């Protein structure tokens, strides 16, 4: 059996929630206690829904505090956010999604980022050869 075909036209008023987007979510540690996450905007040709607002969240994966925070009140014109109030030299899982007038969306691919280090001790150096890609 097989139910469901392809072919979605464009419309002014959002139709359904996005599936792929947000995508290409690239997060980077702005400093030591601040993080910056940016994502790619949805296409127009097949715009599942007009992003009305963006939601971001972060939680220490390898930290004492396992409290996941959530940012509210983010402009839809901002495909990026600057998190402030985290630990230094610690990894954090940032989850950014896109909400539409039709409904909320599922979390996106989490990016592990390690904030700058405080101690004068530098991280390890693991060498490795890269195969043929592309």
Swiss-Prot record:
Q: What is this protein called?
A: Receptor-type tyrosine-protein phosphatase F
What disease is associated with this protein? Aplasia or hypoplasia of the breasts and/or nipples 2: A group of congenital deformities encompassing total absence of breasts and nipple (amastia), absence of the nipple (athelia), and absence of the mammary gland (amazia).
Please specify the portion of the entire protein covered by the chain, as first and last position out of its full length: 596 to 716 of 1907
Task: Name the family the entry cites.
Answer: Belongs to the protein-tyrosine phosphatase family. Receptor class 2A subfamily.
Q: For the Fibronectin type-III domain, which residue ranges apply?
A: 21-118
Q: How does it assemble?
A: Interacts with GRIP1. Interacts with PPFIA1, PPFIA2 and PPFIA3. Interacts with INSR.
Q: Where is this region: Disordered?
A: 105-124
Summarizing the function annotation, the protein's role is:
Possible cell adhesion receptor. It possesses an intrinsic protein tyrosine phosphatase activity (PTPase) and dephosphorylates EPHA2 regulating its activity.
Q: Where does the record place it?
A: Membrane
